[PDB]
Design an enzyme around this catalytic site. Structure first.
Site, PDB file in Angstrom:
ATOM      1  N   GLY A  25       0.826  -1.181   0.000  1.00 57.52           N
ATOM      2  CA  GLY A  25       0.000   0.000   0.000  1.00 57.52           C
ATOM      3  C   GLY A  25       0.876   1.253   0.000  1.00 57.52           C
ATOM      4  N   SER A  27       2.821   4.564   1.310  1.00 57.16           N
ATOM      5  CA  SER A  27       3.667   4.706   2.491  1.00 57.16           C
ATOM      6  C   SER A  27       2.845   5.131   3.686  1.00 57.16           C
ATOM      7  CB  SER A  27       4.727   5.777   2.231  1.00 57.16           C
ATOM      8  OG  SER A  27       4.084   7.037   2.006  1.00 57.16           O
ATOM      9  N   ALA A  28       1.825   5.915   3.398  1.00 54.28           N
ATOM     10  CA  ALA A  28       0.969   6.417   4.446  1.00 54.28           C
ATOM     11  C   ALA A  28      -0.231   5.529   4.726  1.00 54.28           C
ATOM     12  CB  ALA A  28       0.504   7.824   4.077  1.00 54.28           C
ATOM     13  N   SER A  29      -0.316   4.398   4.046  1.00 52.73           N
ATOM     14  CA  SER A  29      -1.455   3.505   4.236  1.00 52.73           C
ATOM     15  C   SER A  29      -1.635   2.922   5.617  1.00 52.73           C
ATOM     16  CB  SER A  29      -1.351   2.346   3.249  1.00 52.73           C
ATOM     17  OG  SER A  29      -0.219   1.586   3.644  1.00 52.73           O
ATOM     18  N   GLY A  30      -0.608   2.967   6.464  1.00 51.85           N
ATOM     19  CA  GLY A  30      -0.694   2.353   7.789  1.00 51.85           C
ATOM     20  C   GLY A  30      -0.324   0.844   7.771  1.00 51.85           C
ATOM     21  N   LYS A  31       0.182   0.383   6.633  1.00 55.82           N
ATOM     22  CA  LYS A  31       0.552  -1.043   6.475  1.00 55.82           C
ATOM     23  C   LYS A  31       1.555  -1.517   7.528  1.00 55.82           C
ATOM     24  CE  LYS A  31       3.750   0.231   2.474  1.00 55.82           C
ATOM     25  NZ  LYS A  31       5.071  -0.003   3.072  1.00 55.82           N
ATOM     26  N   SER A  32       2.485  -0.649   7.886  1.00 54.95           N
ATOM     27  CA  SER A  32       3.461  -1.041   8.886  1.00 54.95           C
ATOM     28  C   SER A  32       2.785  -1.295  10.235  1.00 54.95           C
ATOM     29  CB  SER A  32       4.489   0.069   9.028  1.00 54.95           C
ATOM     30  OG  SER A  32       5.410  -0.289  10.008  1.00 54.95           O
ATOM     31  N   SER A 100       7.676  -1.398  -1.622  1.00 55.98           N
ATOM     32  CA  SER A 100       7.644  -2.160  -2.897  1.00 55.98           C
ATOM     33  C   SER A 100       6.461  -1.604  -3.685  1.00 55.98           C
ATOM     34  CB  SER A 100       7.377  -3.659  -2.581  1.00 55.98           C
ATOM     35  OG  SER A 100       6.480  -3.732  -1.496  1.00 55.98           O
TER      36      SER A 100
END
Lengths: 177, 182
Positions: A25, A27-32, A100
């Site tokens: 997603g 960078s700001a998607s909150g995926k981390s 990615s």
């Protein structure tokens, strides 16, 4: 004694399947954040071995020799994918939200997982999780993710349940308690 | 769960400590064999998570870009050590018998492990097992440098696989690395 543990035996003994979950997603998607909570619940609430391949542990260690040319950008993804595959081979759930942007980045990791190993005639599951946020290096959304999380006003705990429930639909985990 | 899962919490939840077991010794010392049996026992008999970082999966996967270069040899060793550290970080027992003839080789790996990881003011255990066989015995088919002071010293000459493994595992127990036998 003689030859190494087969996938059947290990799975049997480890009581969980091995696979890789790749959260993709913006960078700001909150995926981390989702990856962290996801690993936490899998290990704590589901009692399995799961491990989040953290961007910085990877960059400062295994991939410290890599810079930012396009070949190095591809190599970073390649090594992280091979490492996830090793965790999956050990019957662990490898988790990552490594940068990615392109479909080809995740497709390359996916392809390494599908490539079989002498551990069988089959590959290891690759679960691409699209962490989608309102759009309200151009990121390319995946065409067919195994899991699609619309991370807008969504409690992180619900986001993760969505991922884990999908894992249960495939039988990757042992029942809870 | 905002800054989630610390070593302590993971250790408590995985019920085993994470560490790396590096089997060093001559190519014909039987070290590769011990690594396989050791992984079997830890996983089967001790019900713990362990993983052997030996084999074609590594040579033709993560390290498929590396050859016989002296620089490639060193890089092979560095990557395996980093990957073993990741397995130990995950509270798994990483196992390897990869070729590393010199003390500097294993010392490099040990250094990464003992270096305080993020959040923790401590490294992770690095267990160097010397699978000791005399040189003439190996040769029964630039010199290897035996470790100055290994955690486990296996006098492997004509020693049965089970005995060597038991000695390694019993050492693990004197450390509490494992959960009580079933």
């Amino acid at each position: 004694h003689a030859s190494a543990l087969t996938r059947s035996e290990r799975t049997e003994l480890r009581n969980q399947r091995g696979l890789t979950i790749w959260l993709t997603g913006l960078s700001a998607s909150g995926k981390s954040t989702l990856a962290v909570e996801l690993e936490h619940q899998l290990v704590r609430d589901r009692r399995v071995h799961a491990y989040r391949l953290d961007g910085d542990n990877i960059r400062f260690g295994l991939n410290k020799d890599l810079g930012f040319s396009e070949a190095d950008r591809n190599e970073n993804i390649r090594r992280i994918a091979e490492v996830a595959k090793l965790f999956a081979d050990s019957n662990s759930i490898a988790i990552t939200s490594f940068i990615s942007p392109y479909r080809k980045d995740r497709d390359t990791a996916r392809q390494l997982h599908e490539v079989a190993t002498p551990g069988e005639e089959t590959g290891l599951p690759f679960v691409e999780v699209y962490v989608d946020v309102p759009v309200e290096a151009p990121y390319e959304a995946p065409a067919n993710p195994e899991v699609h999380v619309k991370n807008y006003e969504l409690p992180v705990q619900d986001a993760v349940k969505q991922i884990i429930d999908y894992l249960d639909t495939k039988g990757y985990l042992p029942a809870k308690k």
